[PDB]
Design an enzyme around this catalytic site. Structure first.
Site, PDB file in Angstrom:
ATOM      1  N   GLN A   1       0.794  -1.232   0.000  1.00 48.62           N
ATOM      2  CA  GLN A   1       0.000   0.000   0.000  1.00 48.62           C
ATOM      3  C   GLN A   1       0.827   1.283   0.000  1.00 48.62           C
ATOM      4  O   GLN A   1       0.603   2.140  -0.862  1.00 48.62           O
ATOM      5  CB  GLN A   1      -1.033   0.020   1.118  1.00 48.62           C
ATOM      6  CG  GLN A   1      -1.859   1.298   1.086  1.00 48.62           C
ATOM      7  CD  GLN A   1      -2.836   1.394   2.204  1.00 48.62           C
ATOM      8  OE1 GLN A   1      -2.742   2.283   3.056  1.00 48.62           O
ATOM      9  NE2 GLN A   1      -3.819   0.498   2.213  1.00 48.62           N
TER      10      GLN A   1
ATOM     11  N   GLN B   1       0.881   3.676  -3.266  1.00 48.76           N
ATOM     12  CA  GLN B   1       0.352   5.033  -3.080  1.00 48.76           C
ATOM     13  C   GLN B   1       1.385   6.150  -3.277  1.00 48.76           C
ATOM     14  O   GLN B   1       1.052   7.168  -3.894  1.00 48.76           O
ATOM     15  CB  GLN B   1      -0.458   5.166  -1.792  1.00 48.76           C
ATOM     16  CG  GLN B   1      -1.765   4.362  -1.856  1.00 48.76           C
ATOM     17  CD  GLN B   1      -2.672   4.440  -0.643  1.00 48.76           C
ATOM     18  OE1 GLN B   1      -2.288   4.855   0.451  1.00 48.76           O
ATOM     19  NE2 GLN B   1      -3.911   4.016  -0.812  1.00 48.76           N
TER      20      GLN B   1
ATOM     21  N   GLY C   1       2.939  -6.165   6.022  1.00 44.46           N
ATOM     22  CA  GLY C   1       3.406  -7.516   5.718  1.00 44.46           C
ATOM     23  C   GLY C   1       3.937  -7.654   4.306  1.00 44.46           C
ATOM     24  O   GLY C   1       4.885  -8.414   4.080  1.00 44.46           O
ATOM     25  N   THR C   2       3.317  -6.931   3.338  1.00 40.29           N
ATOM     26  CA  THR C   2       3.749  -6.929   1.941  1.00 40.29           C
ATOM     27  C   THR C   2       5.001  -6.044   1.808  1.00 40.29           C
ATOM     28  O   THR C   2       6.035  -6.521   1.325  1.00 40.29           O
ATOM     29  CB  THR C   2       2.614  -6.509   1.000  1.00 40.29           C
ATOM     30  OG1 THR C   2       1.506  -7.383   1.169  1.00 40.29           O
ATOM     31  CG2 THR C   2       3.040  -6.537  -0.445  1.00 40.29           C
TER      32      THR C   2
ATOM     33  N   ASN D   1       7.419   8.679   8.722  1.00 36.50           N
ATOM     34  CA  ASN D   1       6.063   9.203   8.583  1.00 36.50           C
ATOM     35  C   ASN D   1       5.718  10.295   9.594  1.00 36.50           C
ATOM     36  O   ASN D   1       4.921  11.173   9.259  1.00 36.50           O
ATOM     37  CB  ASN D   1       5.029   8.080   8.589  1.00 36.50           C
ATOM     38  CG  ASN D   1       4.523   7.679   7.226  1.00 36.50           C
ATOM     39  OD1 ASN D   1       4.884   8.261   6.183  1.00 36.50           O
ATOM     40  ND2 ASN D   1       3.675   6.649   7.213  1.00 36.50           N
TER      41      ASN D   1
ATOM     42  N   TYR E   1      -2.781  10.359   3.926  1.00 33.44           N
ATOM     43  CA  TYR E   1      -1.728   9.776   3.088  1.00 33.44           C
ATOM     44  C   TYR E   1      -1.537  10.598   1.804  1.00 33.44           C
ATOM     45  O   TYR E   1      -0.405  10.766   1.366  1.00 33.44           O
ATOM     46  CB  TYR E   1      -1.999   8.298   2.771  1.00 33.44           C
ATOM     47  CG  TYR E   1      -1.822   7.322   3.928  1.00 33.44           C
ATOM     48  CD1 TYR E   1      -2.710   6.264   4.115  1.00 33.44           C
ATOM     49  CD2 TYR E   1      -0.729   7.414   4.791  1.00 33.44           C
ATOM     50  CE1 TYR E   1      -2.527   5.324   5.140  1.00 33.44           C
ATOM     51  CE2 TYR E   1      -0.538   6.482   5.825  1.00 33.44           C
ATOM     52  CZ  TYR E   1      -1.443   5.433   5.997  1.00 33.44           C
ATOM     53  OH  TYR E   1      -1.316   4.487   7.006  1.00 33.44           O
TER      54      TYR E   1
ATOM     55  N   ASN F   1       2.106  11.850   0.877  1.00 33.70           N
ATOM     56  CA  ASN F   1       2.673  11.377  -0.379  1.00 33.70           C
ATOM     57  C   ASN F   1       3.070  12.467  -1.339  1.00 33.70           C
ATOM     58  O   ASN F   1       4.085  12.309  -2.017  1.00 33.70           O
ATOM     59  CB  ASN F   1       1.762  10.349  -1.039  1.00 33.70           C
ATOM     60  CG  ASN F   1       1.535   9.109  -0.195  1.00 33.70           C
ATOM     61  OD1 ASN F   1       2.183   8.894   0.840  1.00 33.70           O
ATOM     62  ND2 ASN F   1       0.559   8.292  -0.579  1.00 33.70           N
TER      63      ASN F   1
ATOM     64  N   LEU G   1      23.093   6.975 -10.893  1.00 38.79           N
ATOM     65  CA  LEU G   1      22.886   5.945  -9.826  1.00 38.79           C
ATOM     66  C   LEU G   1      24.160   5.675  -9.015  1.00 38.79           C
ATOM     67  O   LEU G   1      24.106   5.636  -7.775  1.00 38.79           O
ATOM     68  CB  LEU G   1      22.223   4.596 -10.301  1.00 38.79           C
ATOM     69  CG  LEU G   1      20.659   4.484 -10.391  1.00 38.79           C
ATOM     70  CD1 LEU G   1      20.181   3.040 -10.283  1.00 38.79           C
ATOM     71  CD2 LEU G   1      19.935   5.297  -9.322  1.00 38.79           C
TER      72      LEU G   1
ATOM     73  N   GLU H   1      27.122   7.699  -8.883  1.00 41.08           N
ATOM     74  CA  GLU H   1      27.695   8.883  -8.243  1.00 41.08           C
ATOM     75  C   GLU H   1      27.055   9.255  -6.919  1.00 41.08           C
ATOM     76  O   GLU H   1      27.708   9.803  -6.040  1.00 41.08           O
ATOM     77  CB  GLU H   1      27.684  10.040  -9.206  1.00 41.08           C
ATOM     78  CG  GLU H   1      28.942  10.873  -9.103  1.00 41.08           C
ATOM     79  CD  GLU H   1      29.067  12.057 -10.051  1.00 41.08           C
ATOM     80  OE1 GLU H   1      28.177  12.252 -10.915  1.00 41.08           O
ATOM     81  OE2 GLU H   1      30.066  12.802  -9.925  1.00 41.08           O
TER      82      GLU H   1
END
Ligand SMILES: Nc1nc2c(ncn2[C@@H]2O[C@H](COP(=O)(O)OP(=O)(O)OP(=O)(O)O)[C@@H](O)[C@H]2O)c(=O)[nH]1
Ligand SMILES: Nc1nc2c(ncn2[C@@H]2O[C@H](COP(=O)(O)OP(=O)(O)O)[C@@H](O)[C@H]2O)c(=O)[nH]1
Ligand SMILES: [Mg+2]
Lengths: 48, 431, 432
Positions: free
Chosen positions: B11, B15, B136-137, B198, B216, B220, B244, B246
C-alpha cells in the site's frame, strides 16, 4: 544466494507443513475421543 | 540509454508511486494517457509505436484494493495492465506471510514482468524500490524480491525509498518486528536506502502546510517532491548531475552505512502569497534545521560523513557557494576526521512543479540535502527498543512461527541491527 | 481476504444471530427481500464480506442457521428479516440437546454435524477468498455450547488456516434457564481456548446489570439483552464491513489483538447505552464517548477494566465527528490511565473512525479490549463449577451420555490455567 534462498525455504515447508499437521494430529486425537466415549455410552447401556 | 526500473511494493509503495508518477508527468509534460505534444526523461519512460510514454515501473500488492484504484483512476491509461500486479490474500501485517506463505506464489510472476521491462532497456542502471517497513507486503515481499533481484541481476544498483513507521498513522502493533526483519534481510541486497519517517512528514504537513489532520494524500505529495529532487538528475540533463553510481560513491563510505538523511526546503502552503520568494541562502539555512528533516533525529549529536545539496530552479553557483561559506562559519556542523570534502553540489534548471489543487505553493527555487550522518542510528535505536520490549516476552511471535518462521531468524535480525548500531558508533570515533 | 461465513447455533445463537442480520441489513440499506434501497455507496463497498450477490439486485446473508431443535428456526423464518435467509442454509435436527453439553458435543450434535459441514462447504467453495468463520452461540446451553464447539473443531479440521471467530454468550445466575450452566460453560471454554482465534466474551451477567441498573428496566427480557448484543456486534464488525485502514479483515484484527495464542478472549464495550424503546436521547460528545472505555458500566463482560491491564485495545468511533478530537481524547486517556496499559506492548491502542453511525444514534463508540481483567469472568465460572463438582451434583446427566469425570477435571484445570496466564501478564513488567 541460491543455497541461502533454497535453504531458508527448506526450513519453511519443514515448519509450515508441520505447524498445521501438529494441528491435525490432535484433531485426530479428539475424534479418537468422540467414539471412545460414544461406544462407552453403549457399553454402559447395552450392558445394564 | 541509462534506464531506471521503479518497483512499488504494498500500500505505502503503490500510493507513493501514484504521487511520484503524477509529479513526473507534470514535470515532463506527459498527459494521463501517456501522450505529450530535454530527452533524459527516457530513463524513466519508454515509448511505444503510438508515441505514448509508459513508466518503466512495476506496482505489486498481495491484496487487489490499492492497485484496483490505480487501474480505475486518472492514470489508468498511463500504465499497461501487465505492470499492475495483485494477489488475492494480503500479508495481514505479517512479514512471514509476505516473505514466505503468500509471497512465494506471486514472486515468479513479478520477476517475469520485471524481466520484460529490463528487456526494453539498452543500458539498465538498476532499480528504485518503494515500500513501507510496517506492512506484511511492504516488509516481507520486498526482502523476498530484493534477494531474487540480486540473483537475476548480478551487480546491478538497487536503491530504496523506505517508509519508516509512525504511531500517528501506524496500522499494526507488530510494525517493529516487520521493520527489523525486513532491514536485516534487505541490508546485504541494497546499495543505498533513503528512509522517510512518517512522523517527520506528518509534522511538516501540520507545521508548514497548516493541515490539522494530514492524510496519506498530503504525506505522499510531500514525499513525491523529495523523490523527484533525488531523481531529477537522472530524468533531466542539467549543468550539475549525479547518476545511480555517483550518488552511492559520494554518500556511501562503507557497505552497511548506506542510509542518507534527506532534508527538503522550502515547504510553503498554497495560501499567503507573501511568504516568498526565498533566496538561495534562506533555503540552504533551512536544510540544517531539524524541522525540515525526513527522519526524526539530531545531527548536532552526530557526525557528518557526506553532504550532497541538490538545487532546483533559479539557482546560480555563486549564490550557493556564498550560502555554504556562511554555514561553515557556524562551527556546530561536525564531520568525521577521515572526511575532508563535505559538500557536493548539483543544480538542475527546472523549478519544483506542484500538483494542481495541492497543498504546496509554487516556488522559483528549492533544495534537497542528502547527508550521511551517524545521527540516523537514533531511528534504528527507537525501532530496536520497541522490538526488544515485545521480543523479551515473545509477544506476537507465534504469528510468525505459525507461518514457518523460526525464532532464530528473530535473534539473527536483532543481532544484525545491534551490529549496525555498533557500526554507526565505530564510524564516528576518531582514529 | 474477502468473505466471512457466518454460523448461528442453538436458541441463543439463532436469536442473537437473527438480530445481527436485521441490524446490519438496515445499516447496509438491505430490506427483508434482499434488495438494496439505500442511498450511500459506502453501504455497498464491502457488502461482499457478509452477503453473496444473487441473480440481479439481490443480496443474501452468507449465514448457516443450526439447531438440534426445530422451533427456533421456525421463529427465525417467521421473523422480520426471516425471508432474507437462504432456504438451503437452515440445518436443524428434531432431537434437542436439553441444555446438556454432552448431548450437543457427543451424541445428538455429532449426528447433525455432517449435514451442517455440507452447507458450510457449499458456501466456502463459492468464495473467491474466504477469511474464515464467525459463530454466534451461548456457552450455558447444549446445542450452542456443545454442538457449537464440535462444529468449531470439525471446521478447524477442514479449514485449519482460516480465522475462527466467535461471539460466545456467558451464562449467569441472574438470567439462568438451567442449574447445569457452570458445567456447560467450563466444558465449552476448554474448547474455545484451544480452537478459536478470537472470542468476544458476551456476558449475560453484564447485560442484565446494564438493563436493570442503567436502562432502569425492572424485568429485562432476552429482547432487551439482545438489543445490547446486536449494538455490540454491529460495532465490533464495523471495521470488516466498511472501507477502513485498521483491522479491515479477521487476520489483521487477530494479529493486532492476540499477543499469546490462548489469550484471545475479548472484553467488548459500548457507548452510549440505549434501551429498545429509547429513541430520545440528546447526548454524547467525543470526550464523553472516550471516557466510557474504562467505565465498567459500559462493559459487555462483567469485569472491571481497572482491576487489570489492557494488553491491546481496538476502538471504533462511529458518526460525524472530528478525527483530530478523537486522536487527542484517545491519547489523553492513555496518558491519564498509564497504569492500566502494559508498557511492554508499544502503541497498543489502535483507533478507527467510520462516518456511518448505527441505527438511532448520531454518535457511538465501540471498544474491543484484550484485558487481564477478563480473568474475573473465568474465576466466576470456575467457582460456580467447583461448588457443584465438589459434590458431583448433576454429574449423572453427563456420565449418562458416556462422559468421564476426567474431562470435567481437565476442562476446569485448563480454565484455571487461563486465569493464571492472565494474572502472569498482569504482574509482568518492562524491566526486560
Ligand atoms: N507515507 C505513507 N505511508 C503509508 C501509506 N500507506 C501505508 N503507509 C504506512 O505503512 C505502514 C502500513 O503498511 P502497508 O503498506 O499499508 O501494508 P502492506 O504493504 O500493503 O501490507 P499488507 O496489507 O499487510 O499485506 C504504516 O506505517 C503506514 O503508516 C501511504 O500511502 N503513505
Ligand atoms: N443474551 C441471550 N442469552 C440467551 C438467549 N437465549 C438463551 N440465552 C442464554 O443461553 C444459555 C442457555 O442456552 P441456549 O442457547 O438456550 O441453549 P441451546 O439451544 O441448547 O444452545 C443461558 O445462559 C441463557 O441465559 C437470548 O436470546 N439472548
Ligand atoms: Mg496492504
Amino acid at each position: 544466494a541460491k543455497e541461502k534462498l533454497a535453504q531458508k525455504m527448506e526450513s519453511n515447508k519443514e515448519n509450515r507443513k508441520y505447524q498445521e499437521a501438529e494441528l491435525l494430529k490432535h484433531l485426530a486425537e479428539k475424534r479418537e475421543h468422540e467414539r471412545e466415549v460414544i461406544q462407552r455410552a453403549i457399553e454402559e447401556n447395552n450392558n445394564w | 540509454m541509462r534506464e531506471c526500473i521503479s518497483i512499488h511494493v504494498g500500500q505505502a509503495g503503490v500510493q507513493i508511486g501514484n504521487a511520484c508518477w503524477e509529479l513526473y508527468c507534470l514535470e515532463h509534460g506527459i498527459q494521463p494517457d501517456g501522450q505529450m505534444p530535454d530527452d533524459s526523461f527516457n530513463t524513466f519512460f519508454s515509448e511505444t509505436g503510438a508515441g505514448k510514454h509508459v513508466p518503466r515501473a512495476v506496482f505489486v500488492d498481495l491484496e487487489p484494493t490499492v492497485i484496483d484504484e490505480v487501474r480505475t483512476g486518472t492514470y489508468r491509461q498511463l500504465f499497461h495492465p501487465e505492470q499492475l500486479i495483485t494477489g488475492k490474500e494480503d500479508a495481514a501485517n505479517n512479514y512471514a506471510r509476505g516473505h514466505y506463505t503468500i509471497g512465494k506464489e506471486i514472486i515468479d510472476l513479478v520477476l517475469d514482468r520485471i524481466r520484460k521491462l529490463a528487456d526494453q532497456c539498452t543500458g539498465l542502471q538498476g532499480f528504485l524500490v518503494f515500500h513501507s517497513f510496517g506492512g506484511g507486503t511492504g516488509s516481507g515481499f520486498t526482502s523476498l524480491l530484493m534477494e531474487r533481484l540480486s540473483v537475476d541481476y548480478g551487480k546491478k544498483s538497487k536503491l530504496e525509498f523506505s517508509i519508516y513507521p509512525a504511531p500517528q498513522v501506524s496500522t499494526a502493533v507488530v510494525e517493529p518486528y516487520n521493520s527489523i526483519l525486513t532491514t536485516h534481510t534487505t541490508l546485504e541486497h541494497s546499495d543505498c536506502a533513503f528512509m522517510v519517517d512518517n512522523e517527520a512528514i506528518y509534522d511538516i504537513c501540520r507545521r508548514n502546510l497548516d493541515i490539522e489532520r494530514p492524510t496519506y494524500t498530503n504525506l505522499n505529495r510531500l514525499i513525491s517532491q523529495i523523490v523527484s529532487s533525488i531523481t531529477a538528475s537522472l530524468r533531466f540533463d542539467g549543468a550539475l548531475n549525479v547518476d545511480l553510481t555517483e550518488f552511492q560513491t559520494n554518500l556511501v563510505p562503507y557497505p552497511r552505512i548506506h542510509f542518507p538523511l534527506a532534508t527538503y526546503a522550502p515547504v510553503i502552503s498554497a495560501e499567503k502569497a507573501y511568504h516568498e520568494q526565498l533566496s538561495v541562502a534562506e533555503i540552504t539555512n533551512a536544510c540544517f534545521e531539524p524541522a525540515n528533516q525526513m527522519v526524526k533525529c539530531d545531527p548536532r549529536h552526530g557526525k557528518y560523513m557526506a553532504c550532497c545539496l541538490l538545487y532546483r530552479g533559479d539557482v546560480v553557483p555563486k549564490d550557493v557557494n556564498a550560502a555554504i561559506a556562511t554555514i561553515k562559519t557556524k562551527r556546530s556542523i561536525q564531520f568525521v576526521d577521515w572526511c575532508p570534502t563535505g559538500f557536493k553540489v548539483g543544480i538542475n534548471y527546472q523549478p519544483p512543479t506542484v500538483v494542481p489543487g495541492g497543498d504546496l505553493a509554487k516556488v522559483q527555487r528549492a533544495v534537497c540535502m542528502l547527508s550521511n550522518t551517524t545521527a540516523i542510528a537514533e531511528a534504528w535505536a527507537r525501532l530496536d527498543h520497541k522490538f526488544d520490549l515485545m521480543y523479551a516476552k515473545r509477544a506476537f511471535v507465534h504469528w510468525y512461527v505459525g507461518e514457518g518462521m523460526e525464532e532464530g531468524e528473530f535473534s539473527e535480525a536483532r543481532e544484525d541491527m545491534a551490529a549496525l548500531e555498533k557500526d554507526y558508533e565505530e564510524v564516528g570515533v576518531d582514529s | 481476504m474477502r468473505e466471512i461465513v457466518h454460523i448461528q447455533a442453538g436458541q441463543c445463537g439463532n436469536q442473537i444471530g437473527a438480530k445481527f442480520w436485521e441490524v446490519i441489513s438496515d445499516e447496509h440499506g438491505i430490506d427483508p427481500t434482499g434488495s438494496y434501497h439505500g442511498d450511500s455507496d459506502l453501504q455497498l463497498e464491502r457488502i461482499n464480506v457478509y452477503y453473496n450477490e444473487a441473480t440481479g439486485n439481490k443480496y443474501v446473508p452468507r449465514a448457516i442457521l443450526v439447531d438440534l431443535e426445530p422451533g427456533t428456526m421456525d421463529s427465525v423464518r417467521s421473523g422480520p428479516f426471516g425471508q432474507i435467509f437462504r432456504p438451503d442454509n437452515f440445518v436443524f435436527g428434531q432431537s434437542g440437546a436439553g441444555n446438556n453439553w454432552a448431548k450437543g458435543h457427543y451424541t445428538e450434535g455429532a449426528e447433525l454435524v455432517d449435514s451442517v459441514l455440507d452447507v458450510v462447504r457449499k458456501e466456502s467453495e463459492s468464495c473467491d477468498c474466504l477469511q474464515g468463520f464467525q459463530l454466534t452461540h451461548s456457552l450455558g446451553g447444549g446445542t450452542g455450547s456443545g454442538m457449537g464447539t464440535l462444529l468449531i473443531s470439525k471446521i478447524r479440521e477442514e479449514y485449519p488456516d482460516r480465522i475462527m471467530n466467535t461471539f460466545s454468550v456467558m451464562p449467569s445466575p441472574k438470567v439462568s434457564d438451567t442449574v447445569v450452566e457452570p458445567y456447560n460453560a467450563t466444558l465449552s471454554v476448554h474448547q474455545l481456548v484451544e480452537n478459536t482465534d478470537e472470542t468476544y466474551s458476551i456476558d449475560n451477567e453484564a447485560l442484565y446489570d446494564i438493563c436493570f441498573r442503567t436502562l432502569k428496566l425492572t424485568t429485562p427480557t432476552y429482547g432487551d439483552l439482545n438489543h445490547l448484543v446486536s449494538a455490540t456486534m454491529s460495532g465490533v464488525t464495523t471495521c470488516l464491513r466498511f472501507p477502513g485502514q485498521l483491522n479491515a479483515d479477521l487476520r489483521k484484527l487477530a494479529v493486532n489483538m492476540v499477543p499469546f495464542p490462548r489469550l484471545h478472549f475479548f472484553m467488548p464495550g459500548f457507548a452510549p447505552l440505549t434501551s429498545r424503546g429509547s429513541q430520545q436521547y440528546r447526548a454524547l460528545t467525543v470526550p464523553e464517548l472516550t471516557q466510557q472505555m474504562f467505565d465498567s458500566k459500559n462493559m459487555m463482560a462483567a469485569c472491571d477494566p481497572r482491576h487489570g491491564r489492557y494488553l491491546t485495545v481496538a476502538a471504533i468511533f462511529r458518526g460525524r465527528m472530528s478525527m483530530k478530537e478523537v486522536d487527542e481524547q484517545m491519547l489523553n486517556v492513555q496518558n491519564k490511565n498509564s497504569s492500566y496499559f502494559v508498557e511492554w506492548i508499544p502503541n497498543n491502542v489502535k483507533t478507527a473512525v467510520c462516518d456511518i453511525p448505527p441505527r438511532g444514534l448520531k454518535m457511538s463508540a465501540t471498544f474491543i479490549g484484550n484485558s487481564t481483567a477478563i480473568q474475573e469472568l473465568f474465576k466466576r465460572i470456575s467457582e460456580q463449577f467447583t461448588a457443584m463438582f465438589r459434590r458431583k451434583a448433576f454429574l449423572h446427566w453427563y456420565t449418562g451420555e458416556g462422559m468421564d469425570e476426567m474431562e470435567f477435571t481437565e476442562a476446569e484445570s485448563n480454565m484455571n490455567d487461563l486465569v493464571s496466564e492472565y494474572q502472569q501478564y498482569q504482574d509482568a513488567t518492562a524491566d526486560e
